[PDB]
Amino acid sequence: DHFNYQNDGRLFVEGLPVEQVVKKTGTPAYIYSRATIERHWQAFDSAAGKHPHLICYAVKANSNLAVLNLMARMGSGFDIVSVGELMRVIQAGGDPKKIVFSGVGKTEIEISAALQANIMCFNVESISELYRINSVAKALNVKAPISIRINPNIDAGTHPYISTGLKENKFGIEIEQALDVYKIASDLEFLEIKGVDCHIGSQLTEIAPFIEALDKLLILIDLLAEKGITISHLDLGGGLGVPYDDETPPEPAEYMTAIINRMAGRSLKLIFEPGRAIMANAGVLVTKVEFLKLNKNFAIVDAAMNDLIRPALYSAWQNIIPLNTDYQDGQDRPVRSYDIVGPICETGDFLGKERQLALAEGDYLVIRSTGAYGSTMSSNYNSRCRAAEILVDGEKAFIVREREELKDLWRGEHILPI
Amino acid sequence: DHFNYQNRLFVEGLPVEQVVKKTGTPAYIYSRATIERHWQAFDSKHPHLICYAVKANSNLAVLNLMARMGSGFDIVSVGELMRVIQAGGDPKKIVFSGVGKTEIEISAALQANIMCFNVESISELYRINSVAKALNVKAPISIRINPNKFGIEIEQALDVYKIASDLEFLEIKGVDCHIGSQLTIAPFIELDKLLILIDLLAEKGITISHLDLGGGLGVPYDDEPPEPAEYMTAIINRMRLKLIFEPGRAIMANAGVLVTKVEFLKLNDYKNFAIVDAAMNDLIRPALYSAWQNIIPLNTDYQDGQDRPVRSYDIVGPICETGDFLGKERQLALAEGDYLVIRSTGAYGSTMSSNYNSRCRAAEILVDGEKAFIVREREELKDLWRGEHILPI
Ligand SMILES: Cc1ncc(COP(=O)(O)O)c(/C=N/CCCC[C@H](N)C(=O)O)c1O
Ligand SMILES: Cc1ncc(COP(=O)(O)O)c(/C=N/CCCC[C@H](N)C(=O)O)c1O
Ligand SMILES: [K+]
Ligand SMILES: [K+]
Ligand SMILES: [K+]
Ligand SMILES: [K+]
């Protein structure tokens, strides 16, 4: 990424010092690198090269309009999970023909809207859902393009977590029943089979499971050919992991080449739905130290679990680094071991534990790797306003989401008449 | 609880099916009577104030109910301060907790002339004093004592209470604590150590006008202890002071439910799923804490002749994570299209909700006898991207 300390000592985001942006906007603030976003999307797109492909960015990772728009300009497709996401993508100028719609709980209203926007494909997750789609397509007199989200029989002795996740969880149709449901789809008049889909998990740090999944889906495609069902594309979902702490996942290029090499001599169109791998390290969250409480030690900062929930919800480890490596204001900064915690009234409200840091009250800290599943999971708990989000381009910073104002908190609320 | 089966499930005088028919699902539904009863149970001589913990449920109508009964409020942000004022609450009956209070929040609270700041750090004393000084007022204060990022350890109580005394624009009014939540009596009482501390402060010349015992009193979610009356008694009996209480959950938890519609049933030999239209962005307690929330049908005796084989279901929402669930392994008789009611969601329900997956926040409805009011309108899609802009290249 383009978050880089300089000979100066000061942290920069592309051409701008981070301190400079947060001085205008205040904290807490999400800050995104345009260059990092673009580089990361391209790393995926290029690596797929001559093989017929679409990159359907997973909107759920970060749905900000400016962010989406960056993708839309580069010609990206989008993977969406709601009508809210559909409208976000259209708003941002994304091509609805390049939209696939995932989700186990799609409503008739959402399916109608997506049909009327003429999206590429519905990635279907239940039998009940097939009937619903067909039923809505019928009422509009169109033909709904569909894949089935399939759960391959990944080998558990080689990928135990992925394998049981597939088995235990609400997503997809188990491969053992693939043909049966693909059949039902074929029999349905207002559906039109276009593809096969899967998504095997998230933050995966190995190529093997992806390949394993591909293999079994190719086998399935072939079995479907023989049964006189034609398959125009194969959607391999997202799930490619990133370095948060010490992990070394495959980079997008390597992940893609393995997948392409496995495509051997086929012309089948490959759809990918990455989210995290594109956005995670394309953003940070900046926060200001309010107080230090010394005993265990606490740095109390102005960001909290409503701004970033990943640590509280998943025990995610997110690196926390200072805004300057060489402070020359002569303030006393004893290195100590701090829990970094926010103002919210729960013990669960923390951003990181046991960090070795040299801090004075008033300092700014940067939480790395917060570009994915950061602002999208944010809330107003404790009636805190959602953070500003800023997009940096070279030497220009643009506010791509304004900090909420207090009077927005109770918008649409009503007291009882007396 | 005025959520009661009566034929069909009713909320006070109204069938639940009737309200959700107008508003749609998902929807939070609150009982006015239950809220009032629960606040009164606590209130019902010894000089006291009940400072409802806004964080549990900060909806304006809800806050207003408390305000009408003369309640005080415990707040943790300027956002909560403004909510309480907006709902017609008395700022003189507001105490302000929180480890991370900003100068801006302290200023606003001073200017609104609140009862007390429950202080959690030394640094914070200086900040308050510093802002009070700049406004030329005297900030009323307790120290939150730990008999966690929270509080001052009792071993250092006197030392910091001293520092406070030495500060001119602060004025020591009280002693405060909050020991945890969903407790679940013995730990409460084990008060004792704070009274001892008060006395040690008297001897040091300091005087303490009030003692704030926080919230934390638990409720029945599944099979769980003390009702408010009994909790209070034990505290009174063990007393003399003016007692401040900050209950949240014990007032609101079972004063509300969340209603949701079954979209699909996915059947497998291995596991079954009811996919509903509510999710972890509407109610995060199961995903975040593995909280058990009871999930019950809208009707015990369905007379539409649909086939409802009893099965074991996980109840899950439309959000794209395995973590998005509302409850696990429930024995339920369901058909697609049925409405389910998730109980005990009046506290830490909507207040922790978000827009993840670009889902609009649920409508919230307050029932009074035979009248239902929409106390929070469902968000519209275009509210999702409020304040967002694409780059102009
Ligand atoms: C059908 C489908 N496609 C694509 C993706 C994108 O996956 P990615 O490449 O971003 O790993 C997901 C993510 N579904 C799961 C999201 C889990 C993230 C969690 N809130 C977190 O913060 O880690 C998905 O469910
Ligand atoms: C000063 C103070 N008063 C009252 C309460 C809560 O009162 P209760 O409702 O316990 O009577 C809390 C913390 N409250 C702690 C967090 C709330 C629980 C979590 N979100 C949950 O859903 O279980 C607090 O910090
Ligand atoms: K067909
Ligand atoms: K957002
Ligand atoms: K004083
Ligand atoms: K715009």
Tab-separated table of N, CA and C in Angstrom, chain A residues 9-103:
chain	number	residue	atom	x	y	z
A	9	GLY	N	10.031	10.985	9.105
A	9	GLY	CA	9.477	10.278	10.291
A	9	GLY	C	7.939	10.225	10.296
A	10	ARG	N	7.329	11.052	9.450
A	10	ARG	CA	5.905	11.283	9.457
A	10	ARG	C	5.245	10.318	8.500
A	11	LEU	N	4.037	9.862	8.863
A	11	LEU	CA	3.287	8.911	8.046
A	11	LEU	C	2.537	9.615	6.934
A	12	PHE	N	2.611	9.055	5.740
A	12	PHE	CA	2.036	9.682	4.577
A	12	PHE	C	1.094	8.723	3.941
A	13	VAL	N	0.119	9.278	3.254
A	13	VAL	CA	-0.804	8.510	2.507
A	13	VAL	C	-0.697	9.090	1.129
A	14	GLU	N	-0.198	8.276	0.202
A	14	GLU	CA	0.212	8.762	-1.108
A	14	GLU	C	1.030	10.054	-0.864
A	15	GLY	N	0.664	11.158	-1.491
A	15	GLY	CA	1.427	12.384	-1.356
A	15	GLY	C	1.180	13.236	-0.121
A	16	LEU	N	0.270	12.831	0.761
A	16	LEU	CA	-0.123	13.697	1.856
A	16	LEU	C	0.251	13.145	3.218
A	17	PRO	N	0.734	14.012	4.088
A	17	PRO	CA	0.842	13.603	5.474
A	17	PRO	C	-0.555	13.300	6.063
A	18	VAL	N	-0.643	12.231	6.838
A	18	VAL	CA	-1.888	11.842	7.435
A	18	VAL	C	-2.323	12.909	8.422
A	19	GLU	N	-1.399	13.479	9.179
A	19	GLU	CA	-1.745	14.518	10.150
A	19	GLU	C	-2.482	15.676	9.483
A	20	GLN	N	-2.182	15.924	8.217
A	20	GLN	CA	-2.748	17.048	7.502
A	20	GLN	C	-4.212	16.835	7.232
A	21	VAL	N	-4.563	15.631	6.809
A	21	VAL	CA	-5.975	15.340	6.531
A	21	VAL	C	-6.789	15.358	7.838
A	22	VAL	N	-6.364	14.628	8.832
A	22	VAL	CA	-7.144	14.578	10.033
A	22	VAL	C	-7.242	15.930	10.769
A	23	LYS	N	-6.384	16.887	10.411
A	23	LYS	CA	-6.429	18.215	11.021
A	23	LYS	C	-7.659	18.924	10.509
A	24	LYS	N	-7.963	18.779	9.216
A	24	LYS	CA	-9.158	19.400	8.663
A	24	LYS	C	-10.411	18.687	9.201
A	25	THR	N	-10.449	17.361	9.072
A	25	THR	CA	-11.647	16.577	9.328
A	25	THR	C	-11.876	16.232	10.799
A	26	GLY	N	-10.815	16.190	11.591
A	26	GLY	CA	-10.880	15.640	12.937
A	26	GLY	C	-10.902	14.105	12.952
A	27	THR	N	-10.819	13.533	14.138
A	27	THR	CA	-10.929	12.110	14.323
A	27	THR	C	-12.240	11.778	15.044
A	28	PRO	N	-12.740	10.553	14.929
A	28	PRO	CA	-12.134	9.493	14.135
A	28	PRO	C	-12.391	9.660	12.684
A	29	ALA	N	-11.499	9.092	11.886
A	29	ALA	CA	-11.608	9.255	10.444
A	29	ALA	C	-11.044	8.065	9.714
A	30	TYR	N	-11.802	7.563	8.760
A	30	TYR	CA	-11.298	6.533	7.861
A	30	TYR	C	-10.615	7.236	6.724
A	31	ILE	N	-9.453	6.715	6.331
A	31	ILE	CA	-8.719	7.285	5.218
A	31	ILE	C	-8.356	6.232	4.216
A	32	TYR	N	-8.675	6.488	2.962
A	32	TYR	CA	-8.487	5.500	1.901
A	32	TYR	C	-7.517	6.000	0.832
A	33	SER	N	-6.674	5.084	0.341
A	33	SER	CA	-5.755	5.328	-0.778
A	33	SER	C	-6.369	4.974	-2.096
A	34	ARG	N	-6.574	5.953	-2.956
A	34	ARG	CA	-7.078	5.664	-4.317
A	34	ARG	C	-6.145	4.729	-5.097
A	35	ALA	N	-4.843	5.016	-5.017
A	35	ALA	CA	-3.849	4.250	-5.735
A	35	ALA	C	-3.849	2.797	-5.256
A	36	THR	N	-3.886	2.584	-3.951
A	36	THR	CA	-3.903	1.236	-3.431
A	36	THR	C	-5.129	0.477	-3.889
A	37	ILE	N	-6.285	1.137	-3.939
A	37	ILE	CA	-7.509	0.461	-4.380
A	37	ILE	C	-7.368	0.007	-5.826
A	38	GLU	N	-6.887	0.929	-6.652
A	38	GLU	CA	-6.738	0.681	-8.084
A	38	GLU	C	-5.689	-0.407	-8.331
A	39	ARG	N	-4.555	-0.279	-7.693
A	39	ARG	CA	-3.517	-1.269	-7.844
A	39	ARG	C	-4.057	-2.641	-7.509
A	40	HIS	N	-4.792	-2.740	-6.398
A	40	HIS	CA	-5.274	-4.043	-5.928
A	40	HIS	C	-6.328	-4.636	-6.845
A	41	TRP	N	-7.174	-3.809	-7.439
A	41	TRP	CA	-8.167	-4.321	-8.374
A	41	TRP	C	-7.468	-4.800	-9.644
A	42	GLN	N	-6.497	-4.017	-10.116
A	42	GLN	CA	-5.738	-4.339	-11.334
A	42	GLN	C	-4.900	-5.601	-11.181
A	43	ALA	N	-4.216	-5.739	-10.047
A	43	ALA	CA	-3.491	-6.968	-9.735
A	43	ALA	C	-4.348	-8.176	-10.030
A	44	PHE	N	-5.626	-8.129	-9.667
A	44	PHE	CA	-6.546	-9.207	-9.997
A	44	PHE	C	-6.903	-9.280	-11.486
A	45	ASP	N	-7.222	-8.130	-12.070
A	45	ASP	CA	-7.722	-8.082	-13.429
A	45	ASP	C	-6.647	-8.481	-14.441
A	46	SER	N	-5.475	-7.884	-14.318
A	46	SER	CA	-4.362	-8.182	-15.211
A	46	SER	C	-4.070	-9.669	-15.156
A	47	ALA	N	-3.807	-10.166	-13.946
A	47	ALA	CA	-3.420	-11.543	-13.752
A	47	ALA	C	-4.366	-12.518	-14.429
A	48	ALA	N	-5.631	-12.150	-14.592
A	48	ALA	CA	-6.548	-12.995	-15.332
A	48	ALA	C	-6.363	-12.869	-16.856
A	49	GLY	N	-5.841	-11.720	-17.300
A	49	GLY	CA	-5.278	-11.576	-18.646
A	49	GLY	C	-6.229	-11.987	-19.726
A	50	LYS	N	-5.754	-12.830	-20.640
A	50	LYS	CA	-6.550	-13.203	-21.825
A	50	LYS	C	-7.737	-14.111	-21.548
A	51	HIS	N	-7.761	-14.791	-20.406
A	51	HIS	CA	-8.886	-15.662	-20.131
A	51	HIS	C	-10.163	-14.850	-19.883
A	52	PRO	N	-11.251	-15.170	-20.583
A	52	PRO	CA	-12.528	-14.473	-20.353
A	52	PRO	C	-12.935	-14.426	-18.881
A	53	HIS	N	-12.953	-13.221	-18.323
A	53	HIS	CA	-13.235	-13.030	-16.915
A	53	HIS	C	-14.011	-11.773	-16.614
A	54	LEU	N	-14.652	-11.783	-15.448
A	54	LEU	CA	-15.146	-10.560	-14.845
A	54	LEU	C	-14.762	-10.479	-13.370
A	55	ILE	N	-14.305	-9.307	-12.968
A	55	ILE	CA	-14.078	-9.044	-11.566
A	55	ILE	C	-15.215	-8.267	-10.966
A	56	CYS	N	-15.992	-8.989	-10.164
A	56	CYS	CA	-17.163	-8.471	-9.480
A	56	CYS	C	-16.825	-8.096	-8.024
A	57	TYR	N	-16.322	-6.891	-7.819
A	57	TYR	CA	-15.986	-6.426	-6.487
A	57	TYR	C	-17.103	-6.673	-5.523
A	58	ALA	N	-16.739	-7.163	-4.349
A	58	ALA	CA	-17.727	-7.479	-3.315
A	58	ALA	C	-18.063	-6.209	-2.495
A	59	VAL	N	-19.213	-5.632	-2.808
A	59	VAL	CA	-19.619	-4.303	-2.311
A	59	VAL	C	-19.640	-4.220	-0.784
A	60	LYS	N	-20.060	-5.319	-0.163
A	60	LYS	CA	-20.120	-5.478	1.281
A	60	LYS	C	-18.860	-5.143	2.053
A	61	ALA	N	-17.710	-5.241	1.408
A	61	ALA	CA	-16.428	-4.943	2.069
A	61	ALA	C	-16.278	-3.465	2.348
A	62	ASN	N	-16.808	-2.678	1.436
A	62	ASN	CA	-16.740	-1.222	1.503
A	62	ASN	C	-17.622	-0.724	0.387
A	63	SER	N	-18.715	-0.087	0.752
A	63	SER	CA	-19.756	0.250	-0.189
A	63	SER	C	-19.810	1.743	-0.469
A	64	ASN	N	-18.794	2.457	-0.033
A	64	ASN	CA	-18.783	3.881	-0.254
A	64	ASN	C	-18.897	4.233	-1.748
A	65	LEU	N	-19.696	5.255	-2.074
A	65	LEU	CA	-19.966	5.606	-3.462
A	65	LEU	C	-18.674	5.945	-4.276
A	66	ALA	N	-17.741	6.643	-3.680
A	66	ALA	CA	-16.535	7.019	-4.353
A	66	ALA	C	-15.739	5.780	-4.629
A	67	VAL	N	-15.701	4.871	-3.672
A	67	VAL	CA	-14.965	3.640	-3.825
A	67	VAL	C	-15.564	2.833	-4.953
A	68	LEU	N	-16.865	2.749	-4.982
A	68	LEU	CA	-17.517	1.950	-5.982
A	68	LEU	C	-17.215	2.569	-7.321
A	69	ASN	N	-17.201	3.890	-7.335
A	69	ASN	CA	-17.027	4.625	-8.559
A	69	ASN	C	-15.662	4.382	-9.132
A	70	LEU	N	-14.653	4.303	-8.284
A	70	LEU	CA	-13.333	3.951	-8.768
A	70	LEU	C	-13.373	2.631	-9.530
A	71	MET	N	-14.037	1.630	-8.972
A	71	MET	CA	-14.131	0.371	-9.652
A	71	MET	C	-14.878	0.553	-10.975
A	72	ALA	N	-15.995	1.268	-10.934
A	72	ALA	CA	-16.862	1.418	-12.096
A	72	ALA	C	-16.093	2.043	-13.292
A	73	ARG	N	-15.198	2.974	-12.998
A	73	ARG	CA	-14.366	3.604	-14.008
A	73	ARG	C	-13.399	2.632	-14.652
A	74	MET	N	-12.850	1.722	-13.857
A	74	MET	CA	-11.952	0.738	-14.403
A	74	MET	C	-12.689	-0.379	-15.112
A	75	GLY	N	-14.008	-0.297	-15.197
A	75	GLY	CA	-14.807	-1.302	-15.895
A	75	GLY	C	-15.197	-2.530	-15.087
A	76	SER	N	-14.999	-2.459	-13.766
A	76	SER	CA	-15.365	-3.530	-12.873
A	76	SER	C	-16.811	-3.918	-12.837
A	77	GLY	N	-17.021	-5.185	-12.518
A	77	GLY	CA	-18.342	-5.678	-12.144
A	77	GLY	C	-18.451	-5.601	-10.615
A	78	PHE	N	-19.623	-5.984	-10.109
A	78	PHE	CA	-19.929	-5.876	-8.700
A	78	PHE	C	-20.714	-7.061	-8.234
A	79	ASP	N	-20.373	-7.541	-7.050
A	79	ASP	CA	-21.149	-8.581	-6.384
A	79	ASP	C	-21.913	-7.891	-5.246
A	80	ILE	N	-23.220	-8.061	-5.220
A	80	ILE	CA	-24.063	-7.367	-4.305
A	80	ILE	C	-24.864	-8.364	-3.521
A	81	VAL	N	-25.370	-7.932	-2.358
A	81	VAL	CA	-26.210	-8.774	-1.517
A	81	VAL	C	-27.522	-8.165	-1.106
A	82	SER	N	-27.872	-7.014	-1.653
A	82	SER	CA	-29.134	-6.373	-1.284
A	82	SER	C	-29.512	-5.360	-2.310
A	83	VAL	N	-30.759	-4.933	-2.269
A	83	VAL	CA	-31.190	-3.853	-3.116
A	83	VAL	C	-30.492	-2.544	-2.736
A	84	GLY	N	-30.149	-2.391	-1.478
A	84	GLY	CA	-29.384	-1.237	-1.040
A	84	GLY	C	-28.094	-1.195	-1.808
A	85	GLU	N	-27.448	-2.363	-1.956
A	85	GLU	CA	-26.165	-2.422	-2.672
A	85	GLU	C	-26.373	-2.208	-4.146
A	86	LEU	N	-27.458	-2.737	-4.673
A	86	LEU	CA	-27.792	-2.520	-6.067
A	86	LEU	C	-27.863	-1.024	-6.355
A	87	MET	N	-28.601	-0.296	-5.516
A	87	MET	CA	-28.774	1.162	-5.715
A	87	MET	C	-27.486	1.918	-5.507
A	88	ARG	N	-26.664	1.467	-4.580
A	88	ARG	CA	-25.372	2.094	-4.381
A	88	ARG	C	-24.543	1.989	-5.649
A	89	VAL	N	-24.498	0.796	-6.221
A	89	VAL	CA	-23.716	0.587	-7.426
A	89	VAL	C	-24.213	1.403	-8.632
A	90	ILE	N	-25.514	1.461	-8.820
A	90	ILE	CA	-26.059	2.283	-9.871
A	90	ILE	C	-25.752	3.728	-9.628
A	91	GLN	N	-25.961	4.164	-8.392
A	91	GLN	CA	-25.676	5.531	-8.031
A	91	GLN	C	-24.241	5.880	-8.409
A	92	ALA	N	-23.299	4.986	-8.127
A	92	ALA	CA	-21.889	5.253	-8.363
A	92	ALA	C	-21.488	5.124	-9.824
A	93	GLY	N	-22.458	4.812	-10.677
A	93	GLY	CA	-22.206	4.683	-12.093
A	93	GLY	C	-21.705	3.320	-12.540
A	94	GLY	N	-21.975	2.297	-11.733
A	94	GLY	CA	-21.598	0.953	-12.077
A	94	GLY	C	-22.553	0.348	-13.076
A	95	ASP	N	-22.032	-0.559	-13.898
A	95	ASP	CA	-22.837	-1.201	-14.952
A	95	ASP	C	-23.681	-2.370	-14.445
A	96	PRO	N	-25.012	-2.232	-14.446
A	96	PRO	CA	-25.826	-3.273	-13.822
A	96	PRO	C	-25.753	-4.585	-14.568
A	97	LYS	N	-25.269	-4.557	-15.804
A	97	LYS	CA	-25.105	-5.776	-16.564
A	97	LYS	C	-23.948	-6.569	-16.013
A	98	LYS	N	-23.064	-5.926	-15.257
A	98	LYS	CA	-21.912	-6.582	-14.670
A	98	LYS	C	-22.094	-6.851	-13.180
A	99	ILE	N	-23.343	-6.987	-12.780
A	99	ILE	CA	-23.666	-7.184	-11.381
A	99	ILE	C	-24.163	-8.599	-11.189
A	100	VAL	N	-23.544	-9.315	-10.262
A	100	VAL	CA	-24.163	-10.541	-9.760
A	100	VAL	C	-24.651	-10.321	-8.341
A	101	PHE	N	-25.763	-10.939	-8.018
A	101	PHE	CA	-26.465	-10.790	-6.760
A	101	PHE	C	-26.438	-12.086	-5.928
A	102	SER	N	-25.620	-12.106	-4.881
A	102	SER	CA	-25.537	-13.190	-3.876
A	102	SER	C	-26.491	-12.942	-2.700
A	103	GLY	N	-26.709	-13.943	-1.867
A	103	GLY	CA	-27.515	-13.759	-0.655
A	103	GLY	C	-28.573	-14.818	-0.407
